[PDB]
């Protein structure tokens, strides 16, 4: 039903300006990186944001994929973030899949982006410190202005 509209290479940074990357175990993590470090570390730092449909109130229906040794797409299934081995779809039948996120700017702050899970309404991509690592997780939005669910998206 909905054909892919656009496909944008992107560097994604979290609330503390750390850059998202896929590690050798296919885990989404963040680390402090200059724009130079981010290029040095491609393709593990370069995310393909594929857009399928405007669905405001919630946002733009997108998938987020990365190409390293294989192409993986981000999934929020079971409220657990993972990279799933699959290509972004040419066409989606609807916007309900666990690989769909609604990308929306934070109201009033046009360059701060949120990514809301389609399949789990009110849950969002977030950065969270676990032990030594900074991880990409899915988090319930418990209050407004939670910077951990806000990102910078740089076009490439």
């Amino acid at each position, epitope marked *: 039903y909905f054909g892919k509209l656009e496909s944008k290479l992107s560097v994604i940074r979290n609330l503390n300006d750390q850059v998202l990357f896929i590690d050798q175990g296919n885990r989404p993590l963040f680390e402090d990186m200059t724009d130079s470090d981010a290029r040095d570390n491609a393709p593990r730092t370069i995310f393909i944001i594929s857009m399928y449909k405007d669905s405001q*109130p919630r946002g733009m229906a997108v998938t987020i994929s990365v190409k390293a040794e294989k192409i993986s797409t981000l999934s929020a299934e079971n409220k657990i973030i993972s990279f799933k081995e699959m290509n972004p779809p040419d066409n989606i039948k609807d916007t309900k899949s666990d690989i769909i996120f609604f990308q929306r700017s934070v*109201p009033g702050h046009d360059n*701060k982006m949120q990514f809301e899970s389609s399949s789990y*309404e*009110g849950y969002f991509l977030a950065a969270e410190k676990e032990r030594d690592l900074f991880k990409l997780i899915l988090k319930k939005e*418990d209050e*407004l*202005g*939670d*910077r951990s669910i806000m990102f910078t998206v740089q076009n490439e």
Partner: antibody, heavy 113, light 108 residues
Framework: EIQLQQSGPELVKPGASVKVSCKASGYSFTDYFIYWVKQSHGKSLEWIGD????????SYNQKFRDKATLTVDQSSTTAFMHLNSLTSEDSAVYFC??????WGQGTLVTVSA | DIQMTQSPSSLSASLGERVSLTCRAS??????LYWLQQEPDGTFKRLIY???SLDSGVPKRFSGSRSGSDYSLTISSLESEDFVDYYCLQYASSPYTFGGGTKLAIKR
């Protein structure tokens, strides 16, 4: 304990300006925006604006964008709202909040000559 | 801007009664609604977030639901402390906007 501690009630003259403060404690200040809300007799609750304490970015209700100026002081983990050009219509209780979840106790501002 | 029409602005009821307050949004806000309670001294407490999630430390008699562009806060059985003010708030779009409030009063 998450706390937002607001400054005391103010009595201020029409045409003057006032600056009210909102001291945050019990969490990492720069992880959450601070919101400001006006409660009046005449217009009930109105959102004024917000601020990102990490970079100072602000958003306003267009009704209040030339009335209110939001700032923070990172070191003291305090948010401020400055109101200019005061009139009787600015008399109200002003609240700060984290997340529109945790709220300050409010600051009454009375404008009178 | 999105207008949140909150009704009724006053509701008279009795201890033990089940009551429901409603907020109607002028545009689609999805699940992006809070319900707030305010005590007489001005203290706010959030009750419900994201339409139907109950905050911690809120009595279980409070619940939130949606049916269409109507959002409701239901109190299953009123207690004395419940006869205060209530407001909804939408966060779908800027500027964030509040309902005009409901005061819960004692019937006589």
């Amino acid at each position: 304990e998450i706390q937002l501690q607001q400054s005391g009630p103010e009595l201020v003259k029409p045409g003057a300006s006032v600056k009210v403060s909102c001291k945050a404690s019990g969490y990492s200040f720069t992880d959450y925006f601070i919101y400001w809300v006006k409660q009046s007799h005449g217009k009930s609750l109105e959102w004024i604006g917000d601020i990102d304490p990490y970079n100072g970015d602000t958003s306003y209700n267009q009704k209040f964008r030339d009335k209110a100026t939001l700032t923070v002081d990172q070191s003291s983990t305090t948010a401020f709202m400055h109101l200019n050009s005061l009139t009787s219509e600015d008399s109200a209780v002003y609240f700060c909040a984290r997340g529109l979840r945790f709220w300050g106790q409010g600051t009454l501002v009375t404008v009178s000559a | 801007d999105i207008q949140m029409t909150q009704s009724p602005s006053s509701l008279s009821a009795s201890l033990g009664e089940r009551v429901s307050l409603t907020c109607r949004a002028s545009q689609d806000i999805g699940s992006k609604l809070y319900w707030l309670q305010q005590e007489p001294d001005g203290t706010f407490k959030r009750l419900i977030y994201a339409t139907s999630s109950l905050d911690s430390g809120v009595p279980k008699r409070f619940s939130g639901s949606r049916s269409g562009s109507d959002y409701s806060l239901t109190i299953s059985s009123l207690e004395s402390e419940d006869f205060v003010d209530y407001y909804c708030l939408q966060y779908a779009s800027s500027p964030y906007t509040f309902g005009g409030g409901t005061k819960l009063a004692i019937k006589r």
